[PDB]
Write a protein that binds this ligand. Structure first.
Ligand SMILES: [Fe+3]
Ligand SMILES: [Fe+3]
Ligand SMILES: [Fe+3]
Ligand SMILES: [Fe+3]
Ligand SMILES: [Fe+3]
Ligand SMILES: [Fe+3]
Ligand SMILES: [Fe+3]
Ligand SMILES: [Fe+3]
Ligand SMILES: [Fe+3]
Ligand SMILES: [Fe+3]
Ligand SMILES: [Fe+3]
Ligand SMILES: [Fe+3]
Ligand SMILES: [Fe+3]
Ligand SMILES: [Fe+3]
Ligand SMILES: [Fe+3]
Ligand SMILES: [Fe+3]
Ligand SMILES: [Fe+3]
Ligand SMILES: [Fe+3]
Lengths: 158, 159, 158, 159, 159
């Protein structure tokens, strides 16, 4: 299906869009002196770009033509006013990256595209790990931010 | 699907049930002075526990509520009176572990739960290997036990 | 001596019962993003199972017939709503593990079973250490949790 | 001599035929839980393939056209019902590999093809060693199988 | 308690008696070409001597007078005519070593001799292990000896 091919392309776009969103979070954090959260965001910005590159390389091998799309300007930073806002946006982004992976897998399953399904398996599993991790950070952030200054004291951790 | 959550929970209970059945087998072997077969069973009891803990960890990560169930008393050690009986029970146990993983996978499949299916793949292949290994032990035991004392003579050598 | 045998059997069951309660605690902690406390509980679950295995091994050597019982489902996790609740249950578990060791010892002492008494000596000493360690963590948990978020900030540490 | 070219080509087919017969034997052994004898056969299947590839390489170098023939289905695994049957077939197989090398050498000899004869010398001596080894295995199997379970007891120890 | 001193002295004699019984067993095994079982017995003869020397040393330290008694001739080697007979005697010997340690401990206990009881604890646990090991050997011997030559075949492999 040209549609399975669309969805695979769209996954590339989604990983690069996520890369930029993470970068935007790193900027917000740095500008507000949360250098720890900033470094985490930057490293994860690079990792999303790596995912997208992984998809590109597979596509090239499997003759799925890739048409690189615009990477949209991230928009959530206009509204962010605390670390909790940023982490909630990042969770939402990953929950989205996951849904788009599952849509892609459904299409591949419908088309009997065994190679594409196999390729995706480690990404399905990585997404479970990432959502769990982000969810856990967000819950720590939310809880520590109930006492003034205390969240800051644990950016100084990680 | 509540059914999927359910089957996932039950797989934990299955792995822990298996862990206890292996422990039971180790005891029987030790009590009847088959230390080599007893060691094998004990190690495999640990491994089944690790499997169950694997499932627990993934569940936690994927927000599948785990409720720990009673781990039944192993009762196959009532009817055991030779090593063949024990290995036969262990074979049936793994055959059941396999079937329950396949049922789990089919529920995942119906639900399009690609992450659960991916998680299960190495277990599917492990079970193939375990059933084969167990099968092959049981064959060997059954053949060797046709001569008095000969099986004993290879608890020593192997294991 | 049937009483000593029975108590020896129940001790195995008590260890495995405890293992499951520790597993249940690690689950509650993980679900609630206390990964540190979760890890402590998981390690201790393994340890409890090791203690049970220890009793099994001695029993086999000493011809104490072991019949493996059911390991009852843990039921405290339904009532836990904070780390404090979890640690308080685990303390109570260890106090019970201790009482049942002392009963088993007393039975052995009545029977003049010097080998069983000697076998049990390191376990008595280990219970003292565990009760102390758990009581101490509970104290620290109870104190830290008087300030919102502060406990979180110290799961992340130790 | 077209006859020499021919016999040279056929030796490749012989080595590959042997490779498959060994593979067949491994399968039979594995299926009947003789993992040690199955490993031996598998390794020897690889080795026969290497022999055939040796012949191919020399042919290429010496401008003897190689045309690859069908590699027949191994069918001796129809009649196998004990390890003795399998080892007996393998012995006959090597006896045939030997005879075919000797026929090859005799054709070379008639043609004064000193390079082919030199090439063959290590294979002649290898076959002597293989027939002896196989022979000795088969004797051992046949003796051990006179007591129930005893052969099994030495798939474990040896191999 | 003179009774405690006494029982302590007798335990030395017991350990040395055991040492000689093991030596006797080694001789029987060697004479009948069971070199592996003979080695095991010889090593265990040394170990019993070490036990007796342990008791002597503690006694000296705790001012319990030691008077060395005659070490009886081992006479169980009159009735031995198979390895089973020998291992059976060794099992009974350890059962007696255990009982005598327990009697010693009970005397200590009555006398509130906490240092003697503490000294004995590792021996109590060692005896548990030795009786289990011996028991398990004897089972294996008895099973293997049901087929002619088979026991011999595992003096070689084990030990
Ligand atoms: Fe399209
Ligand atoms: Fe398109
Ligand atoms: Fe397009
Ligand atoms: Fe991604
Ligand atoms: Fe990501
Ligand atoms: Fe990632
Ligand atoms: Fe399992
Ligand atoms: Fe298993
Ligand atoms: Fe497994
Ligand atoms: Fe415990
Ligand atoms: Fe504990
Ligand atoms: Fe402990
Ligand atoms: Fe060949
Ligand atoms: Fe060959
Ligand atoms: Fe060869
Ligand atoms: Fe001794
Ligand atoms: Fe001893
Ligand atoms: Fe000793």
């Amino acid at each position: 299906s040209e549609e399975l091919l669309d969805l695979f392309n769209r996954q590339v776009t989604q990983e690069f869009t996520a890369s930029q969103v993470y970068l935007s979070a790193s900027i917000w954090f740095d500008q507000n002196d949360w250098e720890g959260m900033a470094a985490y965001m930057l490293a994860h910005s690079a990792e999303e770009r790596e995912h997208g590159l992984g998809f590109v390389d597979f596509a090239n091998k499997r003759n799925i033509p890739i048409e690189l799309q615009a990477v949209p300007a991230p928009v959530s930073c206009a509204e962010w006013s605390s670390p909790e806002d940023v982490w909630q946006s990042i969770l939402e982004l990953e929950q989205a990256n996951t849904r788009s992976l599952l849509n892609l897998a459904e299409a591949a399953s419908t088309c009997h595209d065994f190679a594409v399904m196999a390729f995706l398996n480690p990404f399905h599993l990585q997404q479970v790990n990432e959502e769990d991790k982000i969810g856990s950070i967000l819950a720590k952030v939310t809880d520590e931010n109930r006492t003034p200054g205390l969240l800051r004291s644990l950016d100084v951790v990680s």
